[PDB]
Each structure stands twice: as structure tokens, then as C-alpha cells.
A paper describes a structure:
For 7 of the 20 compounds, it was possible to obtain crystal structures of the complexes bound to N-[name] with loop-in and helical (8, 14, 16, 18, and 20) conformations of the α3-helix region (loop- and helix-binders, respectively). The main difference between the structures is the conformation of residues 104–111, which can adopt either helical or loop-in conformations. In complexes with compounds whose R1 substituent exceeds one atom (compounds 8, 14, 16, 18, and 20), these residues have the helical conformation with an adjacent hydrophobic pocket lined by the side chains of M98, L107, F138, Y139, V150, and W162. Steric clashes between the ligands and residues 105–107 would prohibit these complexes from existing in a loop-in conformation. All ligands occupy the ADP-binding site and form typical interactions, which include hydrogen bonds of the 2-hydroxyl group of the resorcinol ring with the side chain of D93 and with a water molecule that generally mediates interactions with G97. In contrast, for the helix-binding compounds, there is a large favorable entropic contribution to binding, and most of them have a binding enthalpy penalty. This switch in thermodynamic profile is thus directly related to the conformation of the α-helix3 region with compensating differences in enthalpy and entropy of about 60 kJ mol−1 between loop-in and helix-binders. Protein flexibility is another possible contributor to favorable binding entropy. As previously mentioned, the N-[name] crystal structures show higher B-factors for residues 103–111 in the helical conformation, suggesting greater structural flexibility of this region compared to the loop-in conformation. In the helical structures, however, the Q23-N106 interaction is not possible due to the binding site rearrangement, and this may contribute to enhanced flexibility of the helical conformation of the α-helix3 region. on can vary significantly, indicating transition state destabilization playing a role in prolongation of residence time. Helix-binders reach up to 230-fold slower association rates, when compared to loop-binders, indicating a higher transition state energy barrier for helix-binders, as depicted in the right-hand panel of Fig. 6.
Author numbering:
A (entry chain A), B (entry chain A): 16 to 223
The structure:
């Protein structure tokens, strides 16, 4: 039921850098995850133009931010196109390899960690604030999958037995003990207003 | 052979704004066209992972910048995924409508024309420097098409009888008389270094 995969050398090295480098501007993880969600929403919106049945799994195109102080998690939910099992493995493999190489070269040349998104590896900035990331995803052409990594050079993929989401992606950030500010309403509002004010989909910040 | 289409009200209004508003920072058109080319290159690179035959129409993934002082044109060529006839009409229609609305609202609120790309309508910044834009495109699933507009509320689409390009998109900017600086080698190099230094594909500036 649970499949374990080794990250390739470059991605494993990038994840180690993100976890271990001293960098105070951690708030940029939110902008990267929202940007990825917006891109997935653009994809399903575009496909629905030639094929309206693509929206049978859900018409609403939105992003939800769900803080949970009890579980110490910040969840980013979108109703985008979602990812197939192959998409998950390819995005944690071949895509993340070319992106990492180009980004790590720039960091050595004097670039900032905040430019990560320009290299297509923005998702991995989640490890600035999270000790573990769980991704639940559902694409129209596949079953619901759960991807997870606490870094450490590996990730797991399993079919998800949880509540069906219709279509889209849910990124569950298991926050580091010293990073609970990202569970606070005013702090999340501040980051969204600063970095994601022009996203073309409604962003709802859930209250506890 | 030649089909004529009316732009919808919002896009026609955006194109008029771009042509008539006083805005000195025109150089941003290049960044938007290179960004679109990079996105199309990401698309074909991703599709080729599950299907390597997608690269039968060309393996090289690059961007070429071709100035022509005689014809007063700056051409941006890419070997990206290209666009089908439907893609051309949809990108000049439904996609450009939602993007325009969101962008024009921001401009009224105090935003800058330089943020156009965040709204998915970055291509239309070409009209800051061009009096006419011709687009030649070839997608694996369709024939070679020529799209053209001098704004004025309409665009044409025809099957292209020119030289086959294999796969990708060619954007031909017919420059305004006072915008010939964008044909100069040092000026193009300056803009690419400033705004497109981290693009993940080789950018070749052709010499005359
Ligand atoms: C195992 C590594 C993957 C990490 N995750 C979850 C992400 O990057 C990520 C992906 C999507 C997504 N759904 N469908 C789709 O095409 N994308 C996508 C979007 C932008 C770049 C690439 C993408 F695949 C999302 O909505 C939200 C995300 O945070
Ligand atoms: C009639 C209006 C269209 C204007 N043009 C030519 C562009 O926007 C434009 C489009 C592509 C392209 N090829 N394939 C594909 O998917 N794209 C694409 C990329 C980014 C956003 C949307 C896209 F369709 C390109 O390589 C270069 C471009 O300058």
C-alpha cells in the first residue's frame, strides 16, 4: 500500500539547504504555494473551455488557507487540476532536478532564497517552516493520492483512504515548533496582502 | 483563406490603453514575451517525459531574438509547445477577458503597467513598442498558423504558407518608428541581463 522513493541527489541537497541554512525571511513559502495553486487553477480553467465536463468534479475555482493550532498545521487547499500519480513522481523527480541545478548555481553566485519560484522549485520553500509536508491530490484522470516527506532523502506515495476532495490539491504543512506564527490570523493576512494580493482566484483564510 | 475576428470589448480596451497611455518604461515587453516563450518550453519539456515522440518535431529547447533593421522588426522565436488554431482564438478571447478585467481594475487602483504579466495578459505589452504583431505558431496536433493584429479591434488567422518551423512560436514585432532602440544589440543585451537573466533555456541574440 505505501511506496517509498529516494529523491535524486540534487533535490535532496536543495531540501537539506532549505532546512539548514540561516534565512529569516521564511514567510515567502506562502507566496510559492499560492502561486502553484493559482497555476493549477489556470490549468483546469483552460481545459474546461474545450471540455466543460472537466468541471463535473467541481465548478468552484478557489484557494483555502486552513490553520490548525491543535495539530500545528497550516493547510493550503485548491480546486485546481490536481496531479496524477505520475505527476507526483515526475514533479519530485525530473522537473525538480533541472530547477534545482539552475537555482543552486544562482545561490552560489549571490542570489537570494526568495528567487526560488523563478526556477520552478518554489514548493520546496515549504521546508523553511515545515518539518513534514503531506500532499493530498486528485486529478480527473486518476485516484486520490497522498504524497509525504520529512525530507531525509525520501518520500512516500499511497492511495488516499481519507475524505474524497473531488479535484485539486491540499498541501498540509506540519510546522516546526518555532514557526507557529504562521497559524495566526493577522500574520497570514499580512503575508497574503504583501505577496499574493493580485491572485486571480478567491483566497479564503479560515478562522478557528 | 483569411479569417477576421473581433476582439471582445475588454481586450480591445486594454490594447487601446497600451497603445495610447504615456508610459516611458516600454522595455518590459521583452521580459513578458521571453516569459511566455519559457512557459511554452516548460510545457513541451514536461509532455516529452511521458511521450518522447513529442520531440520528433525538434529536440532543441531555446529562444532566439532576431533584430532586422531593414524590415524594422524584432522577432522572438521559441521551440516551445506552440499553439493550435483553437489555442490562438482562446488566448485572444476567453483567457484575455478574465486577465484584462483584473489588470485594468488594478491600474485604476494605482498599479503599474509593469505588473501586466501577473494577470496573464503580458503578451499585449508588445503594443507598447509595436504598431503590428504577427505570430507564426506550430503545435504537434495542428497545422502552421499566422495570427496578426494592428489592434483596431480585430485580428486575423490564416494557415501559414511560409517556411515550416517544426514546432514552436515566432512573435514578429513591427516596431513603431520612434521605437528602433529595440533593434540595437547593446540595448537588447541590457534588457535581457536586467529582466530575463535566470530563464532556464538558452537565449541567443542574433547579430546583423
Ligand atoms: C510532489 C511535489 C509536488 C509539490 N506540490 C504539491 C506542488 O508543487 C503543487 C502542485 C499543484 C498542482 N496541481 N496540479 C498541477 O499541475 N500543479 C502544479 C502547479 C504548479 C507547478 C507544478 C504543478 F504540478 C498545486 O495545485 C499546488 C501545489 O503546491
Ligand atoms: C494570440 C495571442 C497569443 C499571444 N502569444 C503569441 C503568446 O502569448 C505566446 C504564446 C506562446 C505559447 N506557445 N504555446 C503555449 O502554450 N504558449 C503560451 C505561453 C504562455 C501563455 C500562454 C500561451 F498560450 C509562446 O511560446 C510565446 C508567446 O509570446
Amino acid at each position: 500500500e505505501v511506496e517509498t522513493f529516494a529523491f535524486q541527489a540534487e533535490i535532496a541537497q536543495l531540501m537539506s539547504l532549505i532546512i539548514n541554512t540561516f534565512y529569516s525571511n521564511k514567510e515567502i513559502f506562502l507566496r510559492e504555494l499560492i502561486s502553484n495553486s493559482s497555476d493549477a487553477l489556470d490549468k483546469i480553467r483552460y481545459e474546461s473551455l474545450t471540455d466543460p465536463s472537466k468541471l463535473d468534479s467541481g465548478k468552484e475555482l478557489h484557494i483555502n488557507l486552513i490553520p490548525n493550532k491543535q495539530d500545528r498545521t497550516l493547510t493550503i487547499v485548491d480546486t485546481g487540476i490536481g496531479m496524477t500519480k505520475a505527476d507526483l513522481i515526475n514533479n519530485a523527480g525530473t522537473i525538480a532536478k533541472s530547477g534545482t541545478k539552475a537555482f543552486m548555481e544562482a545561490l552560489q553566485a549571490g542570489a537570494d532564497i526568495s528567487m526560488i519560484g523563478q526556477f520552478g522549485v518554489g514548493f520546496y520553500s515549504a521546508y523553511l517552516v515545515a518539518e513534514k509536508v503531506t500532499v493530498i491530490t486528485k486529478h480527473n484522470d486518476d485516484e486520490q493520492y497522498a504524497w509525504e516527506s520529512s525530507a531525509g532523502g525520501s518520500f512516500t506515495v499511497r492511495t488516499d483512504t481519507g475524505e474524497p476532495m473531488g479535484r485539486g490539491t491540499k498541501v498540509i504543512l506540519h510546522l516546526k515548533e518555532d514557526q507557529t506564527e504562521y497559524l495566526e490570523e493577522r500574520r497570514i493576512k499580512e503575508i497574503v496582502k504583501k505577496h499574493s494580493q493580485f491572485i486571480g482566484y478567491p483566497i479564503t483564510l479560515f478562522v478557528e
